[PDB]
Amino acid sequence: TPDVFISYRRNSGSQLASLLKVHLQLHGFSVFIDVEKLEAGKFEDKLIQSVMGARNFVLVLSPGALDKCMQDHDCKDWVHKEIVTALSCGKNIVPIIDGFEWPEPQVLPEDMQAVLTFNGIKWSHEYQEATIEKIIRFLQ
Numbered sequence: 001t002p003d004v005f006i007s008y009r010r011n012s013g014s015q016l017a018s019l020l021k022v023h024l025q026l027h028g029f030s031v032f033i034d035v036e037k038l039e040a041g042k043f044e045d046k047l048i049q050s051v052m053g054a055r056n057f058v059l060v061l062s063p064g065a066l067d068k069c070m071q072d073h074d075c076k077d078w079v080h081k082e083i084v085t086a087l088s089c090g091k092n093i094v095p096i097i098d099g100f101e102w103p104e105p106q107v108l109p110e111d112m113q114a115v116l117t118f119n120g121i122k123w124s125h126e127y128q129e130a131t132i133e134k135i136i137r138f139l140q
C-alpha cells in the first residue's frame, strides 16, 4: 500500500499535486493520488481508507485551499475530511505551501485547527529540486 497520500484542492492545486507525485515516485515512494489510484466502489470509504493506509500525508496548500473548510462543521468538504483523518490517525503531515496565506485558527473547524501546527515546506518554482529534496527529508 502507498507510503504517501497527496491531498489537494482540485480546482487550484491539481498541477502541483501531480508534480509532487511524479517526483516522489522517481525517488522510490509509493504514492496515492486519487486520479491514479482510486478505483471502484464508494469513494468516501475508499478515500478515507487510503489516508489511513499511508504513513505520510502531503497536503498541497494552494491559494485559498482551506476556504471551503471554513464553517464546514458537518465535515462535508473533502480536503477537510482528509485532514481530519490524517490528524486523528497521527500521520506524518507535510504541508506544501504554494501561495497560501496562513489563516487564523479560529476560522477553521476545531477538528482541523491542529493542521496549522505542522512545519510546512515552501514550494519554490526557482529551486524545485531543492524543494523536493526537503520534502523527501520530511517523509518517513
Ligand SMILES: Nc1cccc2cc[n+]([C@@H]3O[C@H](COP(=O)(O)OP(=O)(O)OC[C@H]4O[C@@H](n5cnc6c(N)ncnc65)[C@H](O)[C@@H]4O)[C@@H](O)[C@H]3O)cc12
Pocket (backbone or CB within 6 Å): 006, 007, 008, 009, 010, 011, 033, 034, 035, 038, 043, 047, 077, 078, 079, 082
Ligand atoms: N476521486 C474522487 C471521487 C469522487 C469525489 C471526490 C472528492 C474529493 N476527492 C479528494 O478530495 C480532494 C479534492 O477535493 P475538492 O473539493 O477539490 O474536490 P471536488 O469536490 O471538486 O471533487 C473532485 C472531482 O470529483 C468529481 N466527482 C464528484 N462526484 C463524483 C463521483 N461520484 N465519481 C467520480 N468523481 C466525482 C468532481 O466533479 C470533481 O471533478 C483530493 O485530495 C481528493 O483525494 C476525490 C474525489
